[PDB]
Structure 1
Amino acid sequence: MIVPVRCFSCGKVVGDKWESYLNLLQEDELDEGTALSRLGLKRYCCRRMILTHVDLIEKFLRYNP
């Protein structure tokens, strides 16, 4: 369901980091706990944000017209 732009809690941009995070996982083979720390997502308000998003949009796209 597409990444949230910015953190509900503190407003700090977060719409870009989606793809980066997803590779710092599949590629760079890192753990979430830090893959996030890497993307600069310091405190939990922003963390809980990425760490939790459920990119449903994909399953959506996969339909048709």
Structure 2
Amino acid sequence: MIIPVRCFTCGKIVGNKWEAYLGLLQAEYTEGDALDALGLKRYCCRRMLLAHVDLIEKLLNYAPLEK
């Protein structure tokens, strides 16, 4: 649903770079280049941002709205 706040294996906070990662994928950057410039070093806390789906945005279109 949402990006996890901490990693599952080690426990490093990777929930503070999802918006930065999204903003970095539109400035003519490579996936690996952006992931290395974000601050991730190993593949322990790198798969949380690379392979991650965003379904809450699709779930907000069905959310109740006030009129």
Normalised to the residue count of structure 1, the TM-score between the two structures is: 0.90
Q: Which of 1 and 2 has greater Rg?
A: 2
- Answering whether residue 58 of structure 2 is matched by residue 59 of structure 1, we say yes
1:1-65 counterparts in 2 under 5 A?
A: 1-26=1-26, 28-65=27-64
State the shift of 1:64 in Å: 2.5
Structure 2, unaligned runs of 5 or more: none
Aligned length: 64
Q: Name the Cα RMSD after superposition.
A: 0.9
Structure-2 separation of matches of 1:47 and 1:5: 13
Instruction: Point out 4+ residue stretches in structure 1 off by more than 6 angstroms.
Output: none
Choose between structure 1 and 2: higher helix proportion: 1
User: Identity over the aligned pairs, expressed in percent?
Assistant: 73
> Structure 1, residues 17-65: CA drift from partner, whole Å, max 9, x if none?
0000011101x22111120111101100111111011111111111131
Normalised to the residue count of structure 2, the TM-score between the two structures is: 0.88
